[PDB]
Every structure is written in C-alpha cells, then in structure tokens.
C-alpha cells in the first residue's frame, strides 16, 4: 500500500474536520496507509518553486472550497476543477430518512423530545448579530419550531436572547412558538444524522457547509463572520424569480446584517420550491467524482 501523510494544526474545527474526514476515506475506500499528523488538540488511520505522499518517519521531518480553478494546490471546487463525499453517504442518507423508527431512535438517543408538528431546525454558526431577529421571528410564528443547538459559539447570544441564566448541555426552553434546545458535541457521523433529521440546517465554515449540501434539506450558510455571492451564482440557477429573490435575501441577511425576520418569512412562502431545490443540488453535485478519488487517480497517473 502507498504511504500518505496529512498534517493539520488549527479558529478551531474545520481544519481537523476536513483532514479527519479525508484520512478515513483514503483508508476505507482506497486501501491506503495514511497517518494524520495533527499538530493541535471508524479508523485504521495512524493519527513553491515550479498532504505528503513517499514514506519517511524522521523526527526533523524536513527530510523530504471557495481564482480557485487557477490555484491547483488544494484543488477543491464546485466545477470540473471536487468535494469530500463518501461512496455510501447518499445511500446511507436515504435509508435513514425513509425509516421512521431510525429517525425516532437517534432523536431519542440525544435527549430530544420532538415537538409534534414542529419545524426542526439545526443551527451551528459563529456569533451572528441577527440571531435575535431570527429567534423573534420563530417565536412569533403561528406554527411551532424546535431548534437544536449543539455546544458552540452560538449559545452565548442564545442566552442573551432568552435573558435567563447560562445555558449548557441539556437545557431546553420554550418562548411562544419556538422551543430552544442545547445539544452536546457528538460524533461526526451523528452530526450527519442530525442534518438528515431536521427540515432546515444552518451550518458554517467548510465541512458542515458541504455536509448539509449532501443532506439535501433547505440550508443556510455562515461564512467566517466576498465568497458568499460566488456560491449563490451556481446555487440559485433553477429557482423562479420569487424563490430566487427569497433565497438571496435569506443568505445575505445571515451574513450582512439584514433583517432575519423578513427574509425567513419570505423564504417560507416558497418552501416546496426550496425543498426540491436543495434535493436537486445534492444530486447534481454528487454526479461528479469526489475529492478523495480526485486525489488518488491524479497520483496514479503521476502528473
Ligand atoms: C456541531 C458539530 C460539528 N461537527 C464537525 C463538523 C465539521 O466536521 C467540523 C466543523 O468544521 P467546519 O464545518 O468547517 O466549520 P468551522 O467554522 O469549525 O471551520 C472553519 O473555521 C473558520 C474559522 C474558518 O473558515 C476555517 O478555520 C474553517 O476551518 O465539526 C461535529 O463533528 N459534531 C458537531 O456536533
């Protein structure tokens, strides 16, 4: 087996999130001997002029997605110049979402009592100066909302909105139509089960951004608060004028401080269109070979 060496350091997850995902895939789907040299805090993984792959274990080892098409270094894009996608991910997604008890088991395994008839929204982002306006919109809606919030950089402003004491793992609180719930940091695979379970997934960063695209449900992105509108140029292509406008107002507002209430309600006026659009994007994106295959076939043909 060929030898591959990856090294990630660290602003935190996302660097290890991408490297830990890629390292398992090159072992599992390509039978490679890879060692992830993490420099900072399912396996078989041993964790310029003119990713290290050649084997040398010397101490002084110096013994040797987002323009983007022109840079052929990392080479991770949305066009024919890709994304990390496990071979059986889409199949594992469909079997999970088509089994009613599997959906019930995972939710109940995380201490979540689903509000009957409620829209289920996962939110995982940085500090957004518009969280308060969005939660005011959900709380004032005439249909219930169940919000699942993993432990992270958003529970701070979440607490400042509810106004009570500090919130940690386990606390679940209701205001009007919105019921807020704080989740722990589970496993990467269970985070996929989370995305597959909710009707709307608010992600951020790099990997969860793509993981939610494979989830196939309506989603929202929070980029390290330039490259936002370049993502929407491809994402918005198929929708009608009313749905296109509602998706632009939704995503720009979450990143440029425009009213989260007006945008959210506008997008909800076109939910069947947005639901189908999210499914069609995942199927279109998955039609291209994944990144792990793109890294392997390139090395097999040398250069
Ligand atoms: C919420 C949650 C996330 N995760 C995973 C999702 C990914 O694997 C990883 C999250 O990383 P990302 O999705 O890329 O979001 P991120 O914000 O953590 O990553 C980003 O940080 C910013 C400062 C910069 O854009 C870069 O540094 C980028 O790495 O954590 C879990 O495994 N379990 C969880 O419960």
Residue numbers in the entry: 2 to 11, 13 to 43, 53 to 58, 73 to 75, 85 to 87, 89 to 99, 127 to 128, 132 to 146, ...
Sentences from the study reporting this entry:
We were able to subsequently confirm the GT-B fold by having solved the crystal structure of EarPPpu at 2.3-Å resolution (Data Set S2). Indeed, the EarPPpu C-domain includes residues 184 to 361 and follows the Rossmann fold topology, with six β-strands (β8 to β13) and seven α-helices (α8 to α14). On the other hand, the N-domain (aa 1 to 153 and 362 to 377) could only be built in part. Yet, the structure has a higher-than-usual R-free (35.1%) value at this resolution, which cannot be explained by a simple absence of disordered regions. This is likely due to the N-domain adopting different conformations in different unit cells, causing crystal disorder. Similarly, TDP-Rha in the EarPPpu crystal structure is located in a binding pocket that is composed of residues located in the C-domain. F191EarP, F252EarP, and F258EarP side chains form an aromatic cage that stacks against the base of the nucleotide moiety of TDP-Rha. The sugar ring of the nucleotide is then specifically recognized by a hydrogen bond between the hydroxyl group on C3′ of the sugar and the side chain of Q255EarP. The diphosphate is recognized by hydrogen bonds formed with the side chain guanidine of R271EarP, the Y193EarP side chain hydroxyl, and backbone amides of E273EarP and D274EarP. The binding pocket is closed by the bulky side chain of Y193EarP, which may sterically ensure proper positioning of the rhamnose sugar. The rhamnose sugar itself does not seem to make any contact with the protein and is solvent exposed.
The recently discovered arginine rhamnosylation activates the polyproline-specific bacterial translation elongation factor EF-P. EF-P is rhamnosylated on arginine 32 by the glycosyltransferase EarP. Rhamnosylation is mediated by the recently discovered inverting glycosyltransferase EarP, which utilizes dTDP-beta-l-rhamnose (TDP-Rha) as donor substrate, resulting in α-rhamnosyl-arginine on the acceptor EF-P. Unlike with the common and relatively well understood glycosylation of asparagine, sugar modifications on the guanidino group of arginine appear to be rare, and almost nothing is known about the molecular mechanism. The enzyme is composed of two opposing domains with Rossmann folds, thus constituting a B pattern-type glycosyltransferase (GT-B). While dTDP-β-l-rhamnose is located within a highly conserved pocket of the C-domain, EarP recognizes the KOW-like N-domain of EF-P. Based on our data, we propose a structural model for arginine glycosylation by EarP.
